[PDB]
Design a protein around this ligand. Structure first.
Ligand code: ARA
Length: 305
């Protein structure tokens, strides 16, 4: 009967696959169908709205490939009498200011990046690294606010704990994936032969994974690297390997809550003109490592090694 879309920029990430799964659960519970579409670029984004219109959908949840497409997405949706909810990446206008009137569901990005920095520091302490030969590699995607809030929160936490500001090195990545992060990390590694141990800061698991893979290629053993990702579900293949690596763990937020809650809220809005809150910040987070990832995922209903 009722058709609602769930559009995501990166279907290759377990993070979005999970949102899709829980959106389906919400459809089952409330009685609506979820049209799952990948929107990796702006063109596909706009064409997908047209497809949704053709299928008769009344609204959609979207994680845009580009926050700057916000105006256009809103324009096309108003044109088809569709309600829109943003999940994870906030829409911004042309000047980069947030489109506050579009309901948003997202993680507490600043708080989670601060936790990442706290946990990096703690593990560094446990390994007893001499600060003098250690450094932080921050792989940033500053044009994406949610990404920026995580890496800045993480760097601020490290500086608050006493990590030397001058030994915090930032390098921008061209893509939010392993290859982009790899490339960025490699260029930074060869510039710092004096560093014997590295803390890798990145907004999500893929970003940290690319950083870790680059350190391996420059001869660092796992004991000299500490990378803590963000997303959790995206690090299960790494945490499942026989051997420990420089990727120590990941902060697991709630993609399950994001998929179900944004879908539910869309539904209520469409079916009963029940207006969603403008901002829903989910604060859940748990650190998953090789030692507790299975238990923790099972514990969250994301069952499977
Ligand atoms: O791209 C990231 C995704 O990996 C997840 O962390 C949610 O926020 C998005 O910006």
């Amino acid at each position: 009967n009722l058709k609602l879309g769930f559009l995501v920029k990166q279907p290759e990430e377990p993070w979005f696959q999970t949102e899709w799964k829980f959106a389906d659960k919400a459809g089952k519970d409330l009685g609506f169908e979820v049209i799952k579409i990948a929107v990796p670029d702006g063109e596909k984004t706009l064409n997908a709205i047209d497809s949704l219109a053709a299928s008769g959908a009344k609204g959609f949840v979207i994680c845009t490939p580009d926050p700057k497409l916000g105006s256009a997405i809103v324009a096309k949706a108003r044109g088809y009498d569709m309600k829109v909810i943003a999940v994870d990446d906030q829409f911004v206008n042309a000047k980069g200011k947030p489109m506050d009137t579009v309901p948003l569901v997202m993680m507490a990005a600043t708080k989670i990046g601060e936790r990442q920095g706290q946990e990096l520091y703690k593990e560094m302490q446990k390994r007893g690294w001499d600060v003098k030969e250690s450094a932080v590699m921050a792989i940033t995607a500053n044009e994406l606010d949610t990404a920026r809030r995580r890496t800045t929160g993480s760097m601020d936490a490290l500086k608050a704990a006493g990590f030397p500001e001058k030994q915090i090195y930032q390098v921008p990545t061209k893509s939010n994936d392993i290859p982009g992060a790899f490339d960025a990390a490699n260029s930074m590694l060869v510039q710092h032969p004096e560093v014997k141990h590295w803390l890798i800061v990145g907004m999500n698991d893929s970003t940290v994974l690319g950083g870790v893979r680059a350190t391996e290629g420059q001869g660092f053993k796992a004991a000299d690297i500490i990378g803590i990702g963000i997303n959790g579900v995206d690090a299960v293949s790494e945490l499942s390997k026989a051997q420990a690596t420089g990727f120590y763990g990941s902060l697991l937020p709630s993609p399950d809550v994001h998929g179900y809650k944004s879908s539910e809220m869309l539904y209520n809005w469409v079916a009963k003109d029940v207006e969603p809150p403008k901002f829903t910040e989910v604060t859940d987070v748990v650190l998953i490592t090789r030692d507790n990832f299975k238990e923790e995922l099972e514990k969250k209903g994301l069952g499977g090694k």
